[PDB]
Write a protein that binds this ligand. Structure first.
Ligand SMILES: N[C@@H](Cc1cc(Cl)c(Cl)c(-c2cncc(O)c2)c1)C(=O)O
Ligand SMILES: N[C@@H](Cc1cc(Cl)c(Cl)c(-c2cncc(O)c2)c1)C(=O)O
Lengths: 258, 258
């Protein structure tokens, strides 16, 4: 009867509280998705347990084995009842799991060190003095790898061939690289995270230009799950009440350092 | 086998071509949703017929009879197979029909005549010199009627009690009222339409301030419809290809007069 929620550590969606080892259960964690899970459970009247996805992935199908990894996999194979995380609704994932309507919108976007003479994706695409890259795996890299749009295809060809490697292993490494490269590195990541980092010390990064795509994060459940229909209605209610808007203001701008 | 599509005449989503009476069938119409329907049918491989919703409504349940009107009603009662229109995904509609993930995002927003000293919803709420209103029926009026948010509740109390009536029967009447009122009337409508009108002659209106809410338009089908699953995957594909973005650019800014 206790709902098994899979999620992932990713600021400010889910983080461990600084004093977590003194605490127990769901109270160990805080963040946008922590609050969102509590609001959903409250409205739906169920008990739940926050668990962290074992492989630290969002969800992709291995070409060789055809096995789904990440939170998507935990749902497909019945290891969890629901995923609450900044998990993008995509065509390939929609075919294997159910998604709520989006609880938050986003797009791929450009992060620069303040002063970097870049304003758009097209700008980056037409030069090489300012190196630019993204995560060495995951959805943004796949977006570029697969894009048939001229500018993005040019950007991909550059990134894959650029030396030294313009890719990084983690978002922290990416942001650290922006900050240390003296304007000579720009970073591609989701607008939500870009905006969050813009409001934190040392206040030396900025989101520039329009988003490169448009998509949403959804709550995910195994295909045909009865819990899925209910949680989707809950997300629609919370949105219509303005609670989702308050939640973003809480975690993005209220706790704003810049 | 021919899919019955219900839709509604609403610029620039669906309009009759200036020479329509010389034409036949789907070719009579043009617009964002006309192109979107063609792109969906092409990908899904079905034939379809565009029909216009008989009562000219989007979809609401009559409190007395409990009967659904508009496009939602045509789906609920089996008069149409699918609705393709700027139809908002809402909690009450989601309970009675299926919706794709959103094909376009929007929010309620403020339209002013250029020069009108208003920048936000809060601005309007704290004064009465500049009258403000909305459609005399439909979703925006219902949004204000039902809102528990302080500023919007204040705005509703003002609108319902303001004399002369700040409400209008049609969007054209609303926009005409903005243009003729010499800065003494402001209008509340969906951001999509606000942005469209901003780019058309006489270029004397402007969208100001952030949106008041956040929501999406979805393709709708009867609950449990097998066509529904397929079209949803199609919408996700078109989005991921950038085709939805091209479609908005086509109808909003490419044909831009301002
Ligand atoms: N939405 C993604 C997972 C994800 C979440 C978040 Cl919050 C961020 Cl910020 C990113 C990211 C994307 N590009 C560069 C980066 O450093 C991080 C990726 C999915 O569903 O696969
Ligand atoms: N999305 C709505 C229908 C609808 C569509 C559009 Cl494109 C516009 Cl612009 C409006 C509108 C809202 N407020 C003032 C106005 O003049 C028009 C309403 C629904 O699903 O009920």
């Amino acid at each position: 009867k206790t709902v098994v929620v899979t999620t992932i550590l990713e600021s400010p969606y889910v983080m461990m509280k600084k004093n977590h080892e003194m605490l127990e259960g769901n109270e160990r964690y805080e963040g946008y998705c922590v609050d969102l899970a509590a609001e959903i459970a409250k409205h739906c009247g169920f008990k739940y347990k926050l668990t962290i996805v074992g492989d630290g992935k969002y969800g992709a199908r291995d070409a060789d084995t055809k096995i789904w990894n990440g939170m998507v996999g935990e749902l497909v194979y019945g290891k969890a009842d629901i995923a609450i995380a900044p998990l993008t609704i995509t065509l390939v994932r929609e075919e294997v799991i159910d998604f709520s309507k989006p609880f938050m919108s986003l797009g791929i976007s450009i992060m620069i060190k303040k002063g970097t003479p870049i304003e758009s994706a097209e700008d980056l695409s037409k030069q090489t003095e300012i190196a630019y890259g993204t995560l060495d795996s995951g959805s943004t890299k796949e977006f570029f790898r697969r894009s048939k749009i001229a500018v993005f295809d040019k950007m991909w060809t550059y990134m894959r061939s650029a030396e030294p490697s313009v890719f990084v292993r983690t978002t922290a490494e990416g942001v650290a690289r922006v900050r240390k490269s003296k304007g000579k590195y720009a970073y591609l990541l989701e607008s939500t995270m870009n905006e969050y980092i813009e409001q934190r010390k040392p206040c030396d990064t900025m989101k520039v230009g329009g988003n490169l795509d448009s998509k949403g994060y959804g709550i995910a459940t195994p295909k045909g799950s009865s819990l899925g229909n209910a949680v989707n209605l809950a997300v629609l209610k919370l949105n219509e009440q303005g609670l989702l808007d308050k939640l973003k203001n809480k975690w993005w701008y209220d706790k704003g350092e810049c």
